[PDB]
Amino acid sequence: SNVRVLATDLAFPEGPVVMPDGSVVLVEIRAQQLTRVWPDGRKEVVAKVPGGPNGAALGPDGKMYICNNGGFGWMPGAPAPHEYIGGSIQRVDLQSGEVETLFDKCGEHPLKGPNDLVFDKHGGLWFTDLGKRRARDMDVGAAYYIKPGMTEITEQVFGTLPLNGIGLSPDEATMYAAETPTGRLWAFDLSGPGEVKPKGKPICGLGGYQMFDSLAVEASGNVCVATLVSGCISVIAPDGTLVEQVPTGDRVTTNIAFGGPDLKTAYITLSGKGELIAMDWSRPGLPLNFLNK
Ligand SMILES: [Ca+2]
Ligand code: NA
């Protein structure tokens, strides 16, 4: 586990997407932008994304899809009314910087705080909703699926505590969602693309005072979840066994993505220190659709 710092002075980094050349496109939630970090050290702003760009994934159209949580109040907190512009799913052209809003509601219900996302092999898009905190109450968590072609958005999970990381199993027959305040990883069986069948179960709950953020799946099927408070990556087996906890040095570790040769480098956002780091990983990551395979 040879650790290296790839970038600093990032304004709450999140949503890393590791390109084939080892460059990383990621979101800076506090600076409201999509940023490109190159292996020669240089950084460039790809696009300004007003609000709270929170997670990213490359899509079948070659554009970068974004979960926009609508803004926080800044460490993040509950957004004062004016700092919140509504949650949405957006798309960014990585060549022009043009930002287009795709969805801001599902049925008659506005999206609250979209958080992270993952494409299935048909181009359908899963995403979590962490909800928003208000003065005396908070939204429940949810997960959504957008049908291939971006034709329709559907609610698949609703009424958990806030949901954050999301991924698919290698065979894409199971969707995983991390429940932030409880440090529980939930597994949902899929009867087919985009469709949960009964709605799921927690396969792992960490002890102590530990909370979950975003995640990435390994080719083995293990789920690697960024763990807040204790500052590590929690590696969870498909059967829920806690395989290991890899310390990162930052209590606000928020996300992980695999890249490099054989997808055996982990790229991790340390959102407390404002850093993107890389770490050797003993097992290869699961290739993401429309990025790695
Ligand atoms: Ca997240
Ligand atoms: Na990730």
Ligand 2 midpoint to CA 286 (Å): 11
CA distance 33 to 243: 35
Alpha carbon 7 to chain centroid, angstroms = 19
d(CA 128, CA 67): 8
Nearest-ligand number for the alpha carbon of 271: 1
Of residues 95, 36, 23, the one with CA closest to residue 62: 95
Domain map (residue ranges) of the chain: 3-280
CA distance 15 to 213: 11
Phi first, then psi: give them for residue 233, nearest 5 degrees: -105, 120
Check: CB of residue 183 under 8 Å from CB of residue 210: yes
Report the 3 state secondary structure along the chain. Answer: CCEEEEECCCCCEEEEEECCCCCEEEEECCCCEEEEECCCCCEEEEEECCCCEEEEEECCCCCEEEEECCCCECCCECCCHHHCCCCEEEEECCCCCCEEEEECEECCEECCCEEEEEECCCCCEEEEECCCECCCCECCEEEEEECCCCCCEEEEEEEECCEEEEEECCCCCEEEEEECCCCEEEEEEEEECCEECCCCEEEEECCCCCEEEEEEEECCCCEEEEEECCCEEEEECCCCCEEEEEECCCCCEEEEEEECHHHCEEEEEECCCCEEEEEECCCCECCCCCCCC
Binding-site residues for a divalent metal cation, in ranges, read 164, 213
Tokens 């919140």, located at residue: 84
- The residue type at 80: A
* Span from the CA of 239 to the centroid of ligand 2 (angstroms): 20
235 half-sphere exposure, CB direction, 13 A CA radius: 16
**Residue 252 in contact with residue 268, Cβ under 8 Å?**
no
b vs e for 172-200, b when ≥16 Cβ sit within 10 Å of the residue's Cβ? bebbbbbbbebbbbbbbebeebbebeeeb
Of the candidates 44, 47, 40, the residue with the CA atom closest to the CA atom of residue 66: 47
Instruction: Give Rg (Cα) of the chain.
Output: 17
* Cα distance between residue 48 and residue 32, in whole Å: 6
Output the CA angle 286-290-292, nearest 5 degrees.
40
Length of the chain: 293
Q: Are 25 and 66 in contact (CB under 8 A)?
A: no
Determined by X-ray
Q: Which residues are annotated as a binding site for Ca(2+)?
A: 14, 115, 164, 213-214
| Burial of residue 284 (number of CB atoms within 10 Å: 0-12, 13-18, 19+) | middle
Give the Cα separation of 130 and 228 in Å (integer): 15
Q: Which ligand is nearest to the CA of 26?
A: 2
- Would you call 137 a catalytic residue per the annotation? no
- Please tell me the number of the ligand nearest to residue 167's CA: 2
Alpha-carbon distance values, 45 to 27, 109, 136, 236, 289 (Å): 10, 33, 37, 34, 24
Q: How many CB atoms lie within 10 A of CB 211?
A: 20
List of residues 6+ apart from 283 with CB closer than 8 A: 218, 219, 220, 222, 264
Place of tokens 């395989």: 243
Using alpha carbons, select from 103, 216, 185 the residue that is nearest to residue 152: 103
Domain spanning 3-280: which CATH class is it, in words?
A: mainly beta
Q: Which ligand is nearest to the CA of 257?
A: 2
Structure resolution, Å: 1.5
Counting Cα atoms < 13 Å in the Cβ hemisphere of 160 gives 30
Burial 242-261 (b: 16+ CB within 10 A, else e): ebebbebebbbbbbbbbbbe
Q: Cα–Cα distances in Å, from 103 out to 17, 47, 136?
A: 21, 19, 27
Ligand 1: centre distance to CA 212 (Å): 9
What CA–CA distances, in Å, run from 177 to 110, 166, 200, 267? 21, 4, 10, 20
Nearest to 215, CA basis, from 236, 201, 231, 197: 236
CB proximity list for 162: less than 8 A, separation 6 or greater: 113, 130, 131, 138, 139, 140, 141, 179, 180, 181
Q: Which residues pair with 155 in a beta bridge?
A: 144
> CA-to-CA distance for 66 and 100, rounded, in angstroms?
10
- For residues 151 and 146, give the distance between their C-alpha atoms in angstroms, rounded to a whole number: 7
Q: How many angstroms separate the CA atoms of 258 and 267, rounded? A: 6
Q: Which of 280, 226, 217 is nearest to 253 (CA)?
A: 226
What is the 118 CA–ligand 2 centroid distance (Å)? 9
Catalytic member of 116, 129, 213, 250:
213
C-alpha span between 69 and 122 (Å, rounded)? 25
Cα 120 to averaged position of ligand 2 atoms, centre (Å): 14
For ligand 1, the distance from its centroid to the CA atom of residue 129, given in whole angstroms, is: 10
Q: Report d(CA 62, CA 224) in Å as an integer.
A: 26
- CA 255 to ligand 1 center in whole angstroms: 6
**Number of Cβ atoms within 10 Å of the Cβ of 263:** 22
C-alpha neighbours within 13 Å on the C-beta side of residue 4: 10
